[PDB]
Structure formats: structure tokens, C-alpha cells
Design a protein around this ligand. Structure first.
Ligand SMILES: Cc1cc(C)nc(SCC(=O)c2ccc(Cl)c(S(N)(=O)=O)c2)n1
Ligand SMILES: [Zn+2]
Length: 258
């Protein structure tokens, strides 16, 4: 009876195995755009994905991860609200059963169709497993997806999905360039939060871009064909793999703009 996204093991139950689910800096949150403070001291984000080595794509039974070789100083996030340098380890998405839901963060209560998370760990802690035990361990760049025109830089991801339908399937996935998943603007909101999945560790500086990317209905439909179950088990489509907004509690969301 492990955690997941259903009635009996979804978000509302996670607190029994992971009590920090009711902690002081949980994610996601609603971003009230009127209440976010513009911080002129925030720096442009620096996203340096020129040498990113993707390696493989994995279906883990919760989402899928596009993984990067993070054994060298390639694919780094820095600047923004960050001190130091964060290295890209993986990205994944959360999405809905319907286009009117799927994001984890919301913007004045608006829910997007999906949300991409590019996960980076702070090099000062040497690896991802040590970084998640620190309050400044991770920086996640979150990008909303709305349904409209296709994102051409997303199609390679879409096209490999039929090879990783079920939990525990992986496929070789090299030369994937995550710059093709990025909006023109890098204006952002930022706040201190947590992993949105168990173990819900309070180790993330969230950086949510204001400009969504558009993807086509046919691209998101292919996300909804994945399965949460493993091969040979009854089919449970992988949809609605999002945690709802959590209380903001004693936190301030900062805007890099306007
Ligand atoms: C840490 C961890 C360990 C195991 C066994 N599974 C997962 S599934 C979700 C995931 O890979 C993950 C990893 C790190 C981040 Cl930061 C986030 S999220 N949804 O907060 O961006 C999600 N996560
Ligand atoms: Zn995520």
C-alpha cells in the first residue's frame, strides 16, 4: 500500500507515511500574483544547458524522468535567487486527465494542463542524495504547459513514450536538448518549498516561470496513454499525477518582474 495519486493512496493520505506533508514549507502553492513582491535584488536566472547530456527516460510508476549524466559540470542553473550552482539531474511532468487540470502550482487559482519540473541539486553537497537533506539542496525550475500549438522541442520526448508505457520501463534517450522545452521569457516567481512527491523533503528553492509553453492536444494525449501500473497488471492510466496547492503558511513569494 505505497503512495500514489488514487483515492486510497493519493495526496490526502501521504501525511501518514510522511508527516512533513503538514510542514511549514510544503509545495506546491497557489501563486497569488497580486501578493507576490517584486524584488529588484533578484538576478536574471542563468540556465546553461549547452552541454546537457541526457542519457535515458524512465517510467517510475508516478511520472516519467528524462535523466541527465550529472557527473560533470554541465547543465547548470544559477543566478536568480540562488547562491552557488545547481546541476540538472532529471526532468519530469505532472499532468491531468483533462486539459483544465494537471499543474501543481496554480496562478491566482488557475490550473494549467501540465507542469514541467527541471530538478537541479546544489553542487556544494556533492550529490543529489545528500542535497535533499539540506534546506538549500535543490532548485527546481517549474514551467507551465497549456494546450495550443505543438512544442517542437517536446516531440522527441513524446515519441519515445510508447517504449516506456508501464512502470519500470526505461529507454535510451541521448542527445535530448532541454533548451527546446523553455519559454522565451525567464521572468519567474520564487519561494522556499519542498519536493511535491514523497518524501516531501523541505529542500527546494522553487523557481516558477511566468510564461507557459504550449503543447498540442495530441502531445498531452500521449502523456495520458502512459500507465501507473506495471506490465501484466490491470491498466490504470497515468493521469492526474499532481499534488494540489498547500498552505503558504509563513512564506513570501517573490517576483523577478513588474
Ligand atoms: C526523491 C524521489 C525518490 C524516489 C524513489 N522517487 C521519486 S519520484 C518523484 C521525483 O523523482 C522527484 C525528484 C525530485 C523533485 Cl524536486 C521532484 S518535484 N515533483 O518536487 O520536482 C520529484 N522521488
Ligand atoms: Zn515534479
Amino acid at each position: 500500500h505505497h503512495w500514489g495519486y488514487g483515492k486510497h493512496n493519493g495526496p490526502e493520505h501521504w501525511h501518514k507515511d510522511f508527516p512533513i506533508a503538514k510542514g511549514e514549507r510544503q509545495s506546491p502553492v497557489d501563486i497569488d500574483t497580486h501578493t507576490a513582491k517584486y524584488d529588484p535584488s533578484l538576478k536574471p536566472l542563468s540556465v546553461s544547458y549547452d552541454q546537457a547530456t541526457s542519457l535515458r527516460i524512465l517510467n517510475n510508476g508516478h511520472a516519467f524522468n528524462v535523466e541527465f549524466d550529472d557527473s560533470q559540470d554541465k547543465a547548470v542553473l544559477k543566478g536568480g535567487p540562488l547562491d552557488g550552482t545547481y546541476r540538472l539531474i532529471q526532468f519530469h511532468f505532472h499532468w491531468g486527465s483533462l486539459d483544465g487540470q494537471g499543474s501543481e502550482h496554480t496562478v491566482d487559482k488557475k490550473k494549467y494542463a501540465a507542469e514541467l519540473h527541471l530538478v537541479h541539486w546544489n553542487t556544494k553537497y556533492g550529490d543529489f542524495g545528500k542535497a535533499v537533506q539540506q534546506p538549500d539542496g535543490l532548485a527546481v525550475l517549474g514551467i507551465f504547459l497549456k494546450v495550443g500549438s505543438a512544442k517542437p522541442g517536446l516531440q522527441k520526448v513524446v515519441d519515445v513514450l510508447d517504449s516506456i508505457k508501464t512502470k519500470g520501463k526505461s529507454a535510451d534517450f541521448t542527445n535530448f536538448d532541454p533548451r527546446g522545452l523553455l519559454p522565451e521569457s525567464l521572468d519567474y516567481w520564487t519561494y522556499p518549498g519542498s519536493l511535491t512527491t514523497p518524501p516531501l523533503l523541505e529542500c527546494v528553492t522553487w523557481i516558477v516561470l511566468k510564461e507557459p509553453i504550449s503543447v498540442s492536444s495530441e502531445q498531452v494525449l500521449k502523456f495520458r496513454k502512459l500507465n501507473f501500473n506495471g506490465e501484466g497488471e490491470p491498466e490504470e492510466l497515468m493521469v492526474d499525477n499532481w499534488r494540489p496547492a498547500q498552505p503558504l503558511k509563513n512564506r513570501q513569494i517573490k517576483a523577478s518582474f513588474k
